[PDB]
Design a protein around this ligand. Structure first.
Ligand SMILES: CN1[C@@H](CSCC(F)(F)F)Nc2cc(Cl)c(S(N)(=O)=O)cc2S1(=O)=O
Ligand SMILES: CN1[C@@H](CSCC(F)(F)F)Nc2cc(Cl)c(S(N)(=O)=O)cc2S1(=O)=O
Ligand code: NA
Ligand code: NA
Lengths: 475, 475
């Protein structure tokens, strides 16, 4: 009974694309497009996908160096900077993945709760909705993931199809001439006037700055290592990991640019929401862009007190669409798939750390064999952390620390590549064509600059945890 | 012709006491005593002299381990964490010392300029006063330091005597019943009412917070390594360095407490400065503490627009005194002595780095022998940096980076002691009685906490410079 192996389009490309896409695509990108206009939004996107392209090239170069087992992403850190930054960064990576599982299942449970609160009676508590729904969802994901690897692959293909259907729904919705309901909320079809008026920023509110929008977006463009954590479950990784990872990054960035450039030329940043604001012939004068189509939104701009339009209403994308519930389906598919990718990623790193002879820290976790060619001993450890961080259910303060645990790995992977390449390390001969030491050095420096720049105390906590593990292991 | 060696009272105690005392004693301590009252000022002092007591114990333990040449303070860093944090921290230490020479000579030149601007015609430029005076003063200090070591010792004893004379002048001045000039500016003799009213804070202005006052004070309590940088010029360092350094710290702290507790019970925090504010019998009512003695300062407190009193006038200590010019003499002696101690400290570390075989980075500086048992090759290097940072003459922005170069050494010295003591390093047997690994660990952790807490970007620059030197030396 041979194990199942995957090609490059279902085992690498789909996984990375589905882990990069989140709910920022559906709830915040249309808002960032309004705060910062179109050109600066493109600049933010192209700055974010430059760090993850350099890390992508380093990962691709790592993959063409030989055969590495599923979850041996930190082996280069270990054999280039000693086996005590190997295990420490591996443990940080595999703990942050198992926390990201919870930070996604909570986001899915929030949507389920929001739908339940309108269509029927919820159960008594306002926040225990999230806890019960999150725990049930995590148990279902654990069950399907523990039933094999073909089943996880089929579920991921299903989520991909649902996301594509939501994209098509959006794109055919924007081409429909506006109805009164859609017009009165700020939607007109592709107009040249609304495109030009939206190319320049309009910073509004306490969080409306270029660095604020960069800090909102950047953590949702990472997630490129989801096809390299299962390196051993591919038919030939040395051709499948470079091409799959880079195609994922390319197509994700294209979809990020198209959505902003199209939503930025259909909706105005201010709208009333009440249909009694048509033009009255002889209403003195009106000030605003929308009069030339037949709508009068002066009271908003004078008083700054309406809830609709691109800059005020967070769910504009779900009202431009032809059929609204398909966008909710897209949100479900974009959140569950990220949770599943993170749960399969944290299992295959705990299972590599539990069988690492050179890092005996947690090698004592073995009681039951579970020999089904599956990491049963690495799934329960991830499940326990995932549930323990769903019971808390309040995770907006832990997000910076986890997001910096994920950049302490982007720094050490890139620096391990550079250090092994300048030292001429004995056994480091990557054959990937597009790779350079100085690009890796730049990536390793920027990944620390950004990490301290986003929030300075969480970066210190992230460094302190790694340093404590390092020192306790040495002594 | 044997070289000259010093005892423990002139070679260690005087040097450390004179480098700890600065112009904060004369221009800012009476102000901090008014912002934060008396109890919190004592708390600030006793928190600052806890980091430098733990570092003092680590230095004392280092000194009883054997014989170390003049300027080998970093040898423990080198033989406990490799010879590439040895030289890098040694270079950072000896560059920050040679910059502190400039940051003190500029402070002396400022006082000379301020006196010149009143008693006669200055030369044409307002800021070239500082440049010319600073360069001349540094050349005079270099000349006396380069003429030998006995002459430097005699100059330091002279500065010590001048500081003691200013202290006596102050202390006999506060016991004189007030004159009208001194009363109208806010000075009354030791009163019980002004003591109680001044025990509690009164935070005023943009910089008036507990952390603001800690950040002003703390960098002026360090400077305890000035008697350990000349370890080889002592008759027996293993008895002279512990006792001298700890007695310096003790007596400095006593003088810091006495000045604040006595200036806090003689002056009120608000005064007018004009003698027409005596009590007029029948002036309705007056509100304020000073009426019961016979002075009426209501207009100040109502309008917040007067320049005198403890909290508003920075030179209160120079008007309480019996004879004002002796306080100026004390300021001269407190600034020149710190410049001289730093110039002798940076010479004897550059001269140890130029003859270090295991750190060949700057070993190429040797052209002229200068064999006079004096570091002629290490004095010109310090002089060039000192002059280059006096020509700039604007140093209030470089102060944080230098002050963090001085804590990157307090961290590594303490951690080197701890690491060598837990590893049971082969050759580390300190016989100092009062020493503990965990005290050193606490010192090494607090020295980084404070370093990032004072200003977060300058700490990153200070770490980046050390890391760049480390990496460039390895490759
Ligand atoms: C969206 N994620 C961001 C973190 S930003 C949100 C935060 F968690 F910070 F709150 N980074 C990564 C990176 C990787 Cl490499 C992987 S993965 N599955 O390849 O190992 C997963 C993730 S993520 O899904 O957690
Ligand atoms: C007053 N100094 C403070 C720095 S605070 C002012 C700043 F420079 F930061 F702006 N720390 C030290 C420490 C030492 Cl050990 C030595 S010394 N001569 O023993 O080597 C000298 C000094 S200092 O004189 O520079
Ligand atoms: Na997803
Ligand atoms: Na001094």
């Amino acid at each position: 009974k041979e194990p199942v192996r995957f090609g490059w389009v279902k085992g690498v490309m789909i996984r990375c694309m589905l882990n990069i896409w989140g709910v920022i695509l559906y709830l915040r990108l249309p808002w960032i497009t309004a705060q910062a206009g179109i050109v600066l939004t493109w600049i933010i996107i192209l700055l974010s996908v430059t760090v993850t392209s350099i890390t992508g090239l380093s990962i691709s170069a790592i993959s063409t160096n030989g055969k590495v087992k599923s979850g041996g992403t930190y082996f280069l850190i270990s054999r280039s900077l000693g086996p005590e930054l190997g295990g420490s960064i591996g443990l940080i990576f595999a703990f942050a993945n198992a926390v990201g599982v919870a930070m996604h299942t909570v986001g899915f449970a929030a949507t389920v709760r929001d739908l339940l609160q309108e269509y029927g009676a919820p159960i008594v508590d306002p926040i225990n909705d999230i806890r019960i729904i999150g725990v049930v969802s995590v148990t279902v994901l654990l069950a399907i993931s523990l039933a094999g690897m073909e089943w996880e692959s089929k579920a991921q293909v299903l989520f991909f199809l649902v996301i594509m259907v939501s994209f098509a729904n959006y794109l055919v919705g924007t081409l429909i001439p506006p109805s009164e309901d859609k017009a009165s909320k700020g939607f007109f079809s592709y107009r040249a006037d609304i495109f030009v008026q939206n190319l320049v920023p309009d910073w509004r509110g306490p969080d409306g700055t270029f660095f604020g929008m960069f800090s909102i977006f950047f953590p949702s463009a990472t997630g490129i290592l989801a096809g390299a954590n299962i390196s051993g479950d591919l038919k030939d990784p040395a051709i499948a990991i470079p091409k799959g990872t880079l195609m994922a990054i390319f197509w994700t960035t294209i979809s990020y640019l198209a959505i902003s450039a199209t939503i930025g030329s259909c909706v105005v940043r201010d709208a009333s929401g009440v249909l009694n604001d048509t033009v009255t012939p002889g209403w003195g004068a009106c000030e605003g862009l929308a009069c030339s189509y037949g709508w009068n939104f002066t009271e908003c701009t004078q008083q700054h007190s309406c809830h609709y339009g691109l800059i005020n209403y967070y769910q504009t994308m779900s009202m431009v669409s032809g059929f609204a519930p398909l966008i909710t389906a897209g949100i479900f598919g974009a959140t569950l798939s990220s949770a599943l990718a993170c749960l399969v990623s944290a299992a295959k790193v705990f299972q590599c750390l539990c069988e690492d002879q050179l890092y005996p820290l947690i090698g004592f976790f073995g009681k039951g064999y579970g020999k089904n060619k599956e990491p049963v001993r690495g799934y329960l450890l991830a499940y326990a952390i995932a549930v323990a961080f769903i019971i808390i259910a309040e995770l907006n303060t832990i997000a910076p620390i986890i997001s910096n645990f994920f950049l302490c790995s982007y720094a050490l992977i890139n620096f391990s590549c550079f250090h092994a390449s300048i030292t001429n390390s004995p056994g480091w001969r990557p054959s990937f064509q597009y790779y350079n030491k100085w690009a890796a050095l730049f990536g390793a420096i920027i990944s620390v600059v950004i990490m301290f720049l986003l929030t300075w105390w969480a970066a210190l906590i992230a460094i302190g945890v790694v340093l404590f593990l390092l020192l306790y292991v040495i002594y």
